[PDB]
Amino acid sequence: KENLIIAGKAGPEPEILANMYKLLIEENTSMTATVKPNFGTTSFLYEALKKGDIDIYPEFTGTVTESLLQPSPKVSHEPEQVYQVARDGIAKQDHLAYLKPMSYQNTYAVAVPKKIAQEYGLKTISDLKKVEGQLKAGFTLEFNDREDGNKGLQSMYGLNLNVATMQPALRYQAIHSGDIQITDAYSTDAELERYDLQVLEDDKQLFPPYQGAPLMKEALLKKHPELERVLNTLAGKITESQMSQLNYQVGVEGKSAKQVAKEFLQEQGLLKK
Ligand SMILES: C[N+](C)(C)[C@@H](Cc1c[nH]c(=S)[nH]1)C(=O)O
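^ thats the input. predicted complex w/ LW8 below
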């Protein structure tokens, strides 16, 4: 009875996904699983998977192509083609099996409050160049370090924003309290609707498609080939409205994310009872 270490990045959403994995593995295989919530950021999840410290983690397709793949391929904005380059690229580079993606897109999103976008005429990311000497931005450290992040805001848009580096769990409160007026939101985050935040349109298309999918070593899939069929029951499933409600239940209502993942997969017929 092997026990697989399933970890996630920071936030309720990868903890929900890791528990969804654990529920499907424990029911449909002879293995158990342990969920490591908020295990780290993208690179730490990536190097722990290659080092064998963790077994599965939900990785996003544009994050493979931009951060994990070196040199980064020039991909399209079609999510199926971004997945195919990410799956073939991460198998070529690090021998990691990238299973089939989910339906929803959880992208990076430049978000300002609803008052600020109407006060300053902000509708797209290019509109931040009008006002970049006025508002203060609060970004996560990884978004600052990423070429599909604040570095791409500098490179593709010309935006040299007044950026304060933030922890991920404190950026939504600070945009709510008014200490910052720009933050790196995630598309399926419940704090977008909870804090009246208006997502600015990616008019120059800096951000690639970002669909989540299980990422694991190829050797683990060769040892356990049932892991492919079991976890691909989530493939092409879970909408943006469904995932944002799961983040609302765990992150805001304080529900246990193993329970939140269990009721959802039972409601969709993906889990027993
Ligand atoms: C889904 N996403 C928005 C595209 C990001 C979110 C994220 C980046 N770093 C951490 S931690 N979370 C990612 O996982 O790459």
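The chain has 13 helices and ten strands.
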